[PDB]
Amino acid sequence: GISRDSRHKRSATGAKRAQFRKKRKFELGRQPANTKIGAKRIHSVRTRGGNKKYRALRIETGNFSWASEGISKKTRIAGVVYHPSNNELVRTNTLTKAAIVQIDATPFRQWFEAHYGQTLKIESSVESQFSAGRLYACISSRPGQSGRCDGYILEGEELAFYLRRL
C-alpha cells in the first residue's frame, strides 16, 4: 500500500496545487496480503508499540459456525466462486472476509449423527450438501488483520440469497 491522507487527492470543492509533503510514518499502508490456501503461515508484524498483528496468507483450518445452533467447528477450504469486491479475486481463488467459500462438511455430519443419532427439519438445498459433502459458508474473521479464518454456514435464506446471485 501507500497512504491514508486526503492531501494527495481532491476534496468536495475541486482544489489543485497540492505538492504538499514528504509522507509520514502514520500514513502507513502495508502491502495487500491476499490470503490463500496452502500450509498455515502467519506473519507476525509489529505496529503501535507491542501491537502484534497476525497477517495470514495460507490459512486452512476454518472455524465455521453451524447457524441454527451456533456450532463453530473446524474444517478445510476449497475455493470462492463469487466475490465482486474484485471479480478477479475469485478467478485467482484467494480467501478474504465476507467471501462465500466451499467446505467439506464431514465434521458437521459427525456432529449431526452424534447429537441426533440418525443420518440424512433442515432445508433441502442444504440437505443436498449434507448428503454430498461440500456446503457453502461465508468468512467472518479477518485473516489480514486478526490472522484467523472463522465463518458462518449458509442455511436457507442466506443460501438462496447467494444462489440467486451466482
Binding site: 502495508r30 500450509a39 506473519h43 497477517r55 478467478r91
Partner: protein, 338 residues
C-alpha cells in the same frame, strides 16, 4: 555428497530443500535464498549471472549475483506480483495482481503505469519493442517501448487468456484462452492468422489452456491445459497432436524446452506439485523432480543442467541433473561435491 532421489535409472539432486554433522558439512550454494514463507516467480537473466526472484509477503525483487553467490538487493514493490520479464542488463518490467505495471531500473521504479483490466501475463518483443500483455476478456494490450504509446488492442474471445508468448525466430503470437482455442495472432499484421482448437480423448470438463511455449526452430509449439495434459503441435497436420496425461494432473504451468544444451528433443513439464521431463517423438519420461511442497513455477538455467523453482515454502529448491549436463562456471565445484 548430497543424497539423490530414486528415479528411472537416473540421478537428480536438490540444493536448498526443506531438509537442506549437516551443519558442519553444509552444502549451501546461494546465501540468503529464503523468502517470507512462499515464492512467486524465479527466472535467470540472459547473461551468465543475475537471477531474479519475485517476493511473497512485502514482495521484493531479489536479484542474486551468481558470481557472488548471494543477494544484491530487495526492492519491496508496492503490490503483489504474478508475472514479469527481464529486458537486458539492469532493466525489467513487471505487472502485479492489480492492473498496474512497474518498470524497475538500476535505481529501481522508473515508472508505474496501468492497464484497464486485470492482467495475467506479459511478454516482450525484441523486434520493434512492444510488450504484449494478456488480461481478462476481449483485451490483449500493447505497451510499446518505442514512443510509449498504446496500440489498438487485440480483440479476443469472451473470457480471456491465461498466457501469451511470441515465437523467437519468426514471431508468432500465442494466447492461451479459456475455450480451448489458442488464437494465434501475427506480430507483423496485427491480425489473427489461426484459431486452432485443442482436443483430447477423456474430456473431463471444459479445460482451459494455461501454458504456451515455442523454441528456436520456429516450427513447433508446446501447449498446456488446466488439467495436467501436455500437448505438442506443428503445422504438419495441425489438427491432431501428441498428448501427455500426468499422474496427478491439476494444472500445468511451466512447459519449457531443452533447445540450447545437449541431450536433445527433451522438454520439461511442470504442474502444481511435480515437474517432469520427457523426450519428443515418443512421449516417455526422462526424469522427474518431486519436491516436498507444491510449486508456484520453475525455470531452467541455460547452457547447463540445473533448475530453479519457486514454491510455497521458505526456501527455493535448485535441482541439478549430472546426466543432462554439468554444473555452470559459477557452480563449478558442484561436480566436485556431488
Amino acid at each position: 555428497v548430497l543424497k539423490s532421489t530414486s528415479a528411472n535409472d537416473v540421478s537428480v539432486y536438490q540444493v536448498s530443500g526443506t531438509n537442506v554433522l549437516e551443519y558442519q558439512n553444509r552444502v549451501e550454494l546461494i546465501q540468503d535464498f529464503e523468502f517470507s514463507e512462499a515464492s512467486n516467480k524465479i527466472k535467470v537473466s540472459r547473461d551468465g549471472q543475475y537471477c531474479m526472484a519475485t517476493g511473497t509477503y512485502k514482495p521484493q525483487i531479489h536479484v542474486y549475483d551468481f558470481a557472488n553467490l548471494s543477494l544484491k538487493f530487495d526492492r519491496h514493490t508496492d503490490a503483489e506480483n504474478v508475472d514479469f520479464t527481464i529486458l537486458s542488463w539492469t532493466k525489467s518490467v513487471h505487472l502485479q495482481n492489480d492492473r498496474s505495471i512497474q518498470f524497475q531500473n538500476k535505481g529501481g521504479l522508473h515508472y508505474t503505469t496501468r492497464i484497464p483490466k486485470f492482467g495475467r501475463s506479459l511478454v516482450y518483443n525484441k523486434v520493434n519493442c512492444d510488450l504484449y500483455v494478456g488480461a481478462s476478456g476481449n483485451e490483449l494490450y500493447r505497451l510499446n517501448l518505442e514512443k510509449g504509446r498504446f496500440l489498438n488492442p487485440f480483440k479476443l474471445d469472451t473470457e480471456g487468456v491465461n498466457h501469451v508468448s511470441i515465437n523467437e525466430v519468426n514471431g508468432l503470437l500465442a494466447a492461451g484462452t479459456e475455450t480451448n482455442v489458442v488464437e494465434f495472432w501475427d506480430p507483423r499484421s496485427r491480425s489473427r492468422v489461426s484459431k486452432l482448437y485443442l482436443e483430447n480423448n477423456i474430456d473431463n470438463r471444459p479445460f482451459q489452456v494455461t501454458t504456451t511455449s515455442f523454441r528456436n526452430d520456429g516450427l513447433t509449439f508446446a501447449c498446456g491445459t488446466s488439467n495436467g495434459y501436455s500437448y505438442i503441435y506443428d503445422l504438419r497436420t495441425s489438427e491432431p497432436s501428441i498428448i501427455k496425461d500426468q499422474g496427478y494432473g491439476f494444472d500445468i504451468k511451466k512447459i519449457i524446452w531443452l533447445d540450447n544444451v545437449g541431450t536433445e528433443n527433451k522438454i520439461v513439464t511442470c504442474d502444481k506439485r511435480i515437474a517432469k521431463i520427457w523426450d519428443r517423438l515418443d512421449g516417455k519420461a526422462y526424469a522427474s523432480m518431486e519436491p516436498s511442497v507444491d510449486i508456484n513455477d520453475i525455470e531452467h538455467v541455460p547452457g547447463t543442467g540445473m533448475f530453479f523453482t519457486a514454491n510455497e515454502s521458505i526456501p527455493m529448491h535448485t535441482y541439478y541433473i549430472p546426466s543432462l549436463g554439468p554444473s555452470p562456471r559459477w557452480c563449478s565445484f558442484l561436480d566436485s561435491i556431488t
